[PDB]
Design a protein around this nucleic acid. Structure first.
Ligand SMILES: [Cl-]
Ligand SMILES: [Mn+2]
Ligand SMILES: [Mn+2]
Ligand SMILES: [Mn+2]
Ligand SMILES: [Mn+2]
Length: 134
RNA sequence: UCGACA
DNA sequence: ATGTCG
């Protein structure tokens, strides 16, 4: 029941909190459609969140109605709520990740989209195509 | 007390 | 090990 005609996104990190990045790939081919420059400090969930929002913006800009796959239950909820409930401390070092997160929320609250955000069923389909981790 | 998704 | 939700 995999919808191959879709966009798959996923976070990648070195430590958690740690260096965070993310990418979006064509679920069907695996071709990398976009990738975020590594952010010094952030959490896994913030990254998973930014990945979905970037995916929403990527698809809207190209007038695509394809759904987005994410393996993050947390990020999917945050996007649904248009509010990332991260409890990562807000300080000088986490300023960048928080700026991106707040700006992502800002975009969600000022734009519209019908993009279905679907849960990638890892336990049945294996690793999401945009995966970085082992 | 966990269970789940990362 | 941590980040989060049910
Ligand atoms: Cl971003
Ligand atoms: Mn993931
Ligand atoms: Mn990268
Ligand atoms: Mn905010
Ligand atoms: Mn992954």
């Amino acid at each position: 029941e995999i919808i191959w005609e879709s966009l798959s996104v996923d976070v990648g990190s070195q430590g958690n909190p740690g260096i965070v990045e993310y990418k979006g790939v064509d679920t069907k081919t695996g071709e990398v459609l976009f990738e975020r420059e590594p952010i010094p400090i952030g959490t896994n969930n913030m990254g998973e969140f930014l990945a979905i929002v970037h995916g929403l913006r990527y698809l809207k800009e190209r007038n695509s109605r394809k759904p987005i796959y994410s393996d993050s239950q947390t990020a999917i909820k945050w996007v649904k709520d248009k509010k990332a409930k991260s409890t990562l401390v807000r300080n000088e070092e986490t300023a960048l990740i928080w700026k991106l997160v707040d700006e992502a929320e800002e975009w969600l609250n000022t734009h519209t989209y019908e993009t279905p955000i679907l849960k990638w069923q890892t336990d049945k389909w294996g690793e999401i195509k945009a995966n970085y981790g082992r």
